[PDB]
Short mmCIF file of C-alpha atoms in Angstrom, two decimals:
data_model
loop_
_atom_site.label_atom_id
_atom_site.label_comp_id
_atom_site.label_asym_id
_atom_site.label_seq_id
_atom_site.Cartn_x
_atom_site.Cartn_y
_atom_site.Cartn_z
CA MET A 1 -0.01 0.01 0.01
CA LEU A 2 3.00 2.25 0.64
CA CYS A 3 6.61 2.61 -0.49
CA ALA A 4 9.52 1.78 1.81
CA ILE A 5 11.91 4.57 0.62
CA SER A 6 10.12 7.91 0.41
CA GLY A 7 6.93 7.11 2.30
CA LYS A 8 4.65 7.55 -0.69
CA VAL A 9 1.84 5.61 -2.29
CA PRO A 10 3.41 4.09 -5.45
CA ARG A 11 1.49 3.88 -8.70
CA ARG A 12 3.94 1.32 -10.11
CA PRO A 13 5.22 -0.72 -7.14
CA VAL A 14 8.00 -3.27 -7.49
CA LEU A 15 8.96 -6.18 -5.24
CA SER A 16 12.42 -7.43 -4.69
CA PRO A 17 12.70 -11.17 -4.06
CA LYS A 18 15.54 -11.18 -1.50
CA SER A 19 13.72 -9.00 1.03
CA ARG A 20 9.97 -8.61 0.58
CA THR A 21 9.60 -4.84 0.85
CA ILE A 22 7.24 -3.04 -1.50
CA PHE A 23 8.87 0.05 -3.05
CA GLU A 24 8.31 2.35 -6.02
CA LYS A 25 9.80 1.43 -9.42
CA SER A 26 11.91 4.56 -9.85
CA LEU A 27 12.95 4.51 -6.18
CA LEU A 28 14.10 0.87 -6.19
CA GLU A 29 15.86 1.03 -9.54
CA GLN A 30 17.73 4.23 -8.54
CA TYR A 31 19.13 2.56 -5.39
CA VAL A 32 20.27 -0.49 -7.32
CA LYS A 33 22.20 1.74 -9.79
CA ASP A 34 24.19 3.68 -7.19
CA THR A 35 25.14 0.99 -4.63
CA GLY A 36 24.72 -2.58 -5.80
CA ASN A 37 22.53 -3.81 -2.97
CA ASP A 38 19.06 -3.96 -1.49
CA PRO A 39 18.97 -0.93 0.82
CA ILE A 40 16.76 -2.43 3.59
CA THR A 41 18.56 -5.68 4.56
CA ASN A 42 21.86 -4.90 2.73
CA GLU A 43 21.64 -8.05 0.52
CA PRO A 44 22.63 -8.25 -3.16
CA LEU A 45 20.04 -7.03 -5.66
CA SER A 46 19.91 -6.25 -9.38
CA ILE A 47 17.47 -4.41 -11.64
CA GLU A 48 16.46 -7.62 -13.43
CA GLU A 49 15.75 -9.44 -10.15
CA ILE A 50 12.83 -7.24 -9.00
CA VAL A 51 9.18 -8.16 -9.67
CA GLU A 52 6.69 -5.56 -10.89
CA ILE A 53 3.32 -5.66 -9.12
CA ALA A 57 -4.67 4.33 -6.54
CA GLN A 58 -7.18 7.07 -7.41
CA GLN A 59 -6.40 10.76 -6.85
CA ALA A 60 -9.47 13.01 -6.69
CA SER A 61 -8.70 16.38 -8.23
CA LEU A 62 -10.01 19.41 -6.37
CA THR A 63 -12.81 21.40 -8.06
CA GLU A 64 -10.60 24.51 -8.02
CA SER A 65 -8.06 23.04 -10.45
CA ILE A 77 -3.17 28.84 -12.24
CA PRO A 78 -3.96 27.02 -8.97
CA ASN A 79 -2.01 24.05 -10.36
CA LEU A 80 0.79 26.42 -11.37
CA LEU A 81 1.05 28.93 -8.50
CA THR A 82 -0.64 27.65 -5.34
CA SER A 83 -0.02 23.89 -5.65
CA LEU A 84 3.58 23.96 -6.96
CA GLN A 85 5.11 26.27 -4.32
CA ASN A 86 3.78 24.49 -1.21
CA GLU A 87 5.11 21.12 -2.41
CA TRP A 88 8.58 22.72 -2.37
CA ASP A 89 7.68 24.66 0.81
CA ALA A 90 6.48 21.67 2.88
CA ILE A 91 9.49 19.60 1.72
CA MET A 92 12.06 22.20 2.81
CA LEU A 93 10.65 23.27 6.20
CA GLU A 94 10.14 19.60 7.16
CA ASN A 95 13.64 18.58 6.05
CA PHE A 96 15.10 21.62 7.80
CA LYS A 97 13.05 20.71 10.86
CA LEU A 98 14.43 17.18 10.68
CA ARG A 99 18.04 18.39 10.63
CA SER A 100 17.34 20.18 13.90
CA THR A 101 15.96 16.90 15.26
CA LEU A 102 19.07 14.87 14.27
CA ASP A 103 21.54 17.28 15.90
CA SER A 104 19.39 17.60 19.03
CA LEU A 105 19.07 13.83 19.55
CA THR A 106 22.81 13.19 19.42
CA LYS A 107 23.09 15.86 22.09
CA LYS A 108 20.47 13.89 24.00
CA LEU A 109 22.47 10.72 23.26
CA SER A 110 25.59 12.29 24.80
CA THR A 111 23.59 13.18 27.91
CA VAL A 112 22.13 9.65 27.97
CA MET A 113 25.58 7.96 27.81
CA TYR A 114 27.29 10.28 30.34
CA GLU A 115 24.71 9.79 33.07
CA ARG A 116 24.76 6.03 32.40
CA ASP A 117 28.51 5.93 33.10
CA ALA A 118 27.92 8.29 36.03
CA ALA A 119 25.43 5.84 37.56
CA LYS A 120 27.57 2.71 37.10
CA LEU A 121 30.44 4.29 39.04
CA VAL A 122 27.98 4.82 41.87
CA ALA A 123 26.88 1.15 41.73
CA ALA A 124 30.52 0.08 41.55
CA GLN A 125 31.28 2.33 44.50
CA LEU A 126 28.21 1.28 46.54
CA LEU A 127 28.80 -2.44 45.92
CA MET A 128 32.12 -1.94 47.76
CA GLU A 129 30.41 -0.05 50.61
CA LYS A 130 27.47 -2.32 51.50
CA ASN A 131 29.25 -5.67 51.12
CA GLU A 132 32.01 -4.67 53.55
CA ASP A 133 29.60 -3.23 56.10
CA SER A 134 27.59 -6.46 56.17
CA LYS A 135 30.88 -8.31 56.55
CA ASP A 136 31.72 -6.05 59.49
CA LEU A 137 28.37 -7.13 60.98
CA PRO A 138 29.60 -10.71 60.62
CA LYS A 139 32.93 -9.71 62.20
CA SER A 140 31.54 -7.87 65.27
CA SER A 141 30.01 -11.04 66.80
CA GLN A 142 33.53 -12.46 67.16
CA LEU B 102 16.57 9.21 13.42
CA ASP B 103 14.93 5.97 14.58
CA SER B 104 18.29 4.22 14.83
CA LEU B 105 19.30 6.41 17.76
CA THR B 106 15.71 6.82 18.99
CA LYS B 107 16.02 3.23 20.17
CA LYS B 108 19.47 4.17 21.49
CA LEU B 109 17.85 7.16 23.22
CA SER B 110 15.01 5.05 24.67
CA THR B 111 16.98 2.03 25.81
CA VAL B 112 19.61 4.28 27.43
CA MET B 113 17.24 6.43 29.54
CA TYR B 114 15.18 3.42 30.64
CA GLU B 115 18.31 1.46 31.69
CA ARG B 116 19.40 4.69 33.40
CA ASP B 117 16.15 4.87 35.40
CA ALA B 118 16.41 1.14 36.19
CA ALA B 119 19.95 1.75 37.43
CA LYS B 120 18.66 4.80 39.27
CA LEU B 121 16.61 2.38 41.38
CA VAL B 122 19.74 0.23 41.96
CA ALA B 123 21.41 3.08 43.84
CA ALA B 124 18.26 3.86 45.86
CA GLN B 125 18.15 0.33 47.26
CA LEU B 126 21.87 0.24 48.03
CA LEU B 127 22.00 3.69 49.66
CA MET B 128 19.36 2.52 52.15
CA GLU B 129 21.14 -0.83 52.61
CA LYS B 130 24.34 1.01 53.53
CA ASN B 131 22.26 3.04 56.01
CA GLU B 132 20.77 0.02 57.79
CA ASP B 133 24.25 -1.47 57.92
CA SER B 134 25.44 1.88 59.32
CA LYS B 135 23.11 2.45 62.28
CA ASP B 136 23.15 -1.20 63.43
CA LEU B 137 26.96 -1.21 63.73
CA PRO B 138 26.66 2.05 65.73
CA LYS B 139 24.16 0.76 68.30
CA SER B 140 26.06 -2.54 68.75
CA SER B 141 29.67 -1.33 68.99
CA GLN B 142 28.65 1.08 71.76
CA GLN B 143 27.00 -1.71 73.76
CA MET C 1 21.94 -3.55 37.34
CA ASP C 2 19.22 -5.70 38.94
CA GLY C 3 16.50 -3.38 40.17
CA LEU C 4 12.95 -4.70 40.35
CA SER C 5 10.28 -2.38 38.98
CA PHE C 6 7.17 -4.47 39.70
CA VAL C 7 7.69 -5.65 43.31
CA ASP C 8 9.24 -2.43 44.62
CA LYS C 9 6.01 -0.44 45.22
CA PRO C 13 8.70 7.15 46.47
CA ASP C 14 9.47 10.07 44.19
CA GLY C 15 11.79 11.60 46.79
CA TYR C 16 14.20 8.65 46.63
CA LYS C 17 14.30 9.24 42.88
CA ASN C 18 15.27 12.83 43.69
CA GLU C 19 17.64 11.36 46.30
CA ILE C 20 19.22 9.18 43.60
CA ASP C 21 19.30 12.00 41.01
CA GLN C 22 21.62 14.20 43.10
CA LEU C 23 24.24 11.43 43.48
CA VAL C 24 24.22 10.77 39.77
CA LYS C 25 24.63 14.53 39.18
CA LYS C 26 27.43 14.78 41.79
CA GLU C 27 29.38 12.27 39.73
CA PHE C 28 28.42 14.10 36.51
CA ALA C 29 29.51 17.46 37.94
CA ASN C 30 32.86 15.68 38.34
CA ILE C 31 32.98 13.98 34.98
CA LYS C 32 32.01 17.23 33.20
CA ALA C 50 24.37 14.29 -0.93
CA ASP C 51 22.81 16.48 -3.61
CA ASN C 52 23.51 19.37 -6.01
CA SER C 53 23.01 23.11 -5.48
CA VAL C 54 19.30 22.24 -4.91
CA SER C 55 20.50 21.29 -1.41
CA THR C 56 21.86 24.83 -0.89
CA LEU C 57 18.76 26.90 -1.68
CA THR C 58 16.28 24.47 -0.08
CA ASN C 59 18.29 24.96 3.11
CA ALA C 60 18.56 28.70 2.59
CA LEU C 61 14.91 29.39 1.82
CA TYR C 62 13.83 27.39 4.88
CA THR C 63 16.30 29.10 7.25
CA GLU C 64 15.24 32.59 6.09
CA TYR C 65 11.63 31.36 6.30
CA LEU C 66 10.43 33.79 3.60
CA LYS C 67 7.99 32.82 0.87
CA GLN C 68 9.00 33.57 -2.72
CA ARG C 69 7.05 36.30 -4.47
CA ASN C 70 4.63 35.35 -7.25
CA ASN C 71 3.32 37.45 -10.13
CA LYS C 72 -0.07 36.94 -11.80
CA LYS C 73 -1.84 38.77 -14.64
CA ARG C 74 -5.12 38.74 -12.69
CA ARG C 75 -3.40 40.35 -9.67
CA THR C 76 -2.10 43.17 -11.83
CA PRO C 77 -5.63 43.93 -13.10
CA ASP C 78 -4.36 46.09 -15.94
CA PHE C 79 -6.06 46.24 -19.37
CA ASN C 80 -4.54 47.60 -22.57
CA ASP C 81 -1.56 49.15 -20.75
CA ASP C 82 0.57 48.78 -23.92
CA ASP C 83 1.48 45.99 -26.34
CA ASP C 84 3.13 43.53 -23.96
CA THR C 85 0.07 43.75 -21.73
CA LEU C 86 -2.11 42.75 -24.72
CA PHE C 87 -0.12 39.48 -25.11
CA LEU C 88 -0.68 38.74 -21.41
CA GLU C 89 -4.48 38.90 -21.82
CA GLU C 90 -4.44 36.04 -24.35
CA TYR C 91 -2.82 33.81 -21.75
CA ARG C 92 -6.04 34.25 -19.72
CA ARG C 93 -8.21 32.72 -22.44
CA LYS C 94 -6.54 29.39 -23.21
CA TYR C 95 -6.11 28.76 -19.47
CA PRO C 96 -9.89 29.27 -18.97
CA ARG C 97 -10.73 27.00 -21.87
CA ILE C 98 -8.40 24.35 -20.46
CA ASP C 99 -9.88 24.91 -17.00
CA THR C 100 -13.40 24.45 -18.40
CA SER C 101 -12.09 21.34 -20.14
CA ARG C 102 -10.68 20.02 -16.85
CA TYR C 103 -13.92 21.06 -15.14
CA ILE C 104 -15.80 19.08 -17.85
CA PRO C 105 -14.00 15.72 -17.24
CA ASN C 106 -14.24 16.30 -13.48
CA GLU C 107 -17.99 16.94 -13.70
CA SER C 108 -18.55 13.80 -15.84
CA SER C 109 -18.30 11.37 -12.91
CA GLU C 110 -17.96 13.95 -10.09
CA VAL C 111 -18.94 11.54 -7.28
CA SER C 112 -17.68 8.16 -8.47
CA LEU C 113 -13.96 8.98 -8.78
CA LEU C 114 -14.10 10.60 -5.32
CA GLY C 115 -15.85 7.64 -3.65
CA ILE C 116 -13.32 5.09 -4.90
CA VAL C 117 -10.50 6.88 -3.10
CA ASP C 118 -12.58 7.11 0.12
CA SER C 119 -12.79 3.32 0.26
CA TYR C 120 -9.09 3.26 -0.65
CA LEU C 121 -8.34 5.39 2.41
CA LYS C 122 -10.40 3.01 4.57
CA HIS C 123 -8.39 -0.09 3.57
CA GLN C 124 -5.10 1.76 4.09
CA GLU C 125 -6.17 3.02 7.55
CA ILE C 126 -7.19 -0.39 9.01
CA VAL C 127 -3.69 -1.79 8.35
CA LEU C 128 -2.17 0.67 10.83
CA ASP C 129 -4.81 -0.18 13.44
CA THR C 130 -3.99 -3.77 12.62
CA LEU C 131 -0.36 -2.93 13.42
CA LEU C 132 -1.55 -1.21 16.59
CA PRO C 133 -2.73 -4.59 17.96
CA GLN C 134 0.29 -6.72 16.96
CA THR C 135 2.65 -4.48 18.92
CA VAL C 136 0.33 -4.07 21.90
CA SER C 137 -0.27 -7.82 22.30
CA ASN C 138 3.48 -8.55 21.94
CA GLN C 139 4.68 -5.77 24.29
CA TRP C 140 2.39 -7.07 27.07
CA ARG C 141 3.66 -10.58 26.27
CA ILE C 142 7.06 -9.22 27.23
CA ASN C 143 5.89 -7.64 30.50
CA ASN C 144 3.90 -10.77 31.44
CA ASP C 145 7.12 -12.81 31.36
CA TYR C 146 9.36 -10.41 33.30
CA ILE C 147 6.80 -9.99 36.11
CA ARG C 148 7.02 -13.72 36.79
CA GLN C 149 10.79 -13.28 36.96
CA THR C 150 10.15 -10.16 39.06
CA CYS C 151 8.19 -12.20 41.67
CA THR C 152 10.63 -15.13 41.75
CA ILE C 153 13.68 -13.06 42.66
CA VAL C 154 11.71 -11.20 45.36
CA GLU C 155 10.78 -14.61 46.80
CA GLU C 156 14.39 -15.79 46.89
CA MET C 157 15.69 -12.45 48.19
CA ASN C 158 13.10 -12.58 50.98
CA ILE C 159 14.28 -15.96 52.29
CA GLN C 160 17.83 -14.59 51.94
CA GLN C 161 16.90 -11.56 54.07
CA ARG C 162 14.92 -13.84 56.44
CA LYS C 163 17.99 -16.05 56.92
CA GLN C 164 20.17 -12.92 57.20
CA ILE C 165 18.44 -11.34 60.18
CA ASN C 166 18.24 -14.74 61.96
CA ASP C 167 22.02 -15.27 61.82
CA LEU C 168 22.73 -11.71 63.05
CA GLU C 169 20.67 -12.40 66.20
CA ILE C 170 21.73 -16.06 66.61
CA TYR C 171 25.45 -15.29 66.99
CA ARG C 172 24.69 -12.58 69.58
CA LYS C 173 22.69 -15.13 71.58
CA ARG C 174 25.42 -17.72 71.08
CA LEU C 175 28.10 -15.42 72.49
CA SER D 542 11.80 -2.39 21.71
CA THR D 543 12.06 -1.07 25.26
CA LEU D 544 10.56 -4.23 26.74
CA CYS D 545 12.64 -6.32 24.31
CA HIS D 546 15.99 -5.30 25.82
CA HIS D 547 14.61 -4.58 29.33
CA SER D 548 13.93 -8.28 29.66
CA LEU D 549 17.38 -8.92 28.12
CA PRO D 550 19.24 -7.07 30.86
CA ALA D 551 16.98 -8.15 33.74
CA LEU D 552 17.34 -11.85 32.91
CA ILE D 553 21.14 -11.83 33.33
CA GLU D 554 21.27 -9.67 36.49
CA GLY D 555 18.81 -11.92 38.34
CA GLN D 556 21.47 -14.57 38.96
CA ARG D 557 24.11 -11.95 39.83
CA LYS D 558 21.81 -10.57 42.51
CA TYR D 559 20.90 -13.99 43.86
CA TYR D 560 24.47 -15.39 43.91
CA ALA D 561 25.82 -12.37 45.79
CA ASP D 562 23.21 -13.00 48.50
CA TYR D 563 23.88 -16.78 48.21
CA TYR D 564 27.61 -16.18 48.86
CA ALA D 565 26.55 -13.88 51.68
CA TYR D 566 24.25 -16.68 52.87
CA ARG D 567 27.17 -19.14 52.93
CA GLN D 568 29.36 -16.92 55.13
CA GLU D 569 26.53 -16.45 57.65
CA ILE D 570 26.06 -20.21 57.82
CA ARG D 571 29.78 -20.58 58.55
CA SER D 572 29.42 -18.42 61.65
CA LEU D 573 26.28 -20.28 62.78
CA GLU D 574 28.13 -23.62 62.53
CA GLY D 575 31.11 -22.06 64.30
CA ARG D 576 29.46 -20.30 67.21
CA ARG D 577 27.45 -23.32 68.42
CA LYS D 578 30.54 -25.46 69.16
CA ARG D 579 31.61 -23.08 71.93
CA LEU D 580 28.34 -23.56 73.79
CA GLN D 581 28.78 -27.31 73.24
CA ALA D 582 32.13 -27.10 75.04
CA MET D 583 30.63 -25.49 78.18
CA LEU D 584 28.78 -28.65 79.31
CA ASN D 585 32.02 -30.60 78.95
CA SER D 586 33.62 -28.07 81.32
CA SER D 587 30.93 -28.93 83.93
#
């Protein structure tokens, strides 16, 4: 029903046989030309291996197809992709704060495993 | 994005699970602390 | 590492644990030029200006203006042609995509169950492991307090 | 994915928690077997 590269609804979907993932014909053939592999599972794939397999209701107000429709397709692509680049830099900052506090906690556990186990041993020593 | 979103989620959850590990052991050191005080005096 | 989430049932001890983590963290301290302007137009966040003959609303300004008027006619004939083949069916091409959107939507709510049944099949297994360790730790702690008081009575 | 690896880490640490108390349970048994022999020697002194 969908494509596994762009996130579209393909009109001419193709199926690779090595990993069953439905993708668009121009999107699968483009990937096989650049790097000689299936992108999803990183297995070998060719153009001759793949197997070839929607109604779009036009608005009544269809100069709208030239001015108003064409700009926003390039507007919504840019300000989403620019928003995504802010997400990727922010998450690696949140990865660096995830990894630092993880090592900060394990040094507490490694320090408190030495504190409690010797104090309970000193409870076993005080009876003597 | 979703490669490190798992690496963000599994890290913070294992952090909070290890955050509970200290909270048990800091109270276990305490009960080992006050018992040794009341006994070594007596 | 081992800290039981199910059987241990305070937010202050979380705040008590968060300071000691922080006290150790206070110590430890591919495209063409299309990629350039699509970044630059989004950062500036300014829409590109558009010019239309209708917006100008000028008639017989000169000779160039006269050419512009023609452009209005063949667009309106083509618009009436596109409004003709849209008005031919006009309900039946729109209804076949509404059923198409229904069959696409149920697959995600199908995928909403297969995760939700499997994620609770994970938590159902760990809780049984959560209750087993608490049972063995209890007999460990029960034997622990007995030996601490036995040796005092033995002495 | 959270519950996938949360069971993965909790399954290995369950033995490491239990064996540390089990080794602490063996040392407390060694004192309990050791302290009782001194009270056994008192009735021989009578």
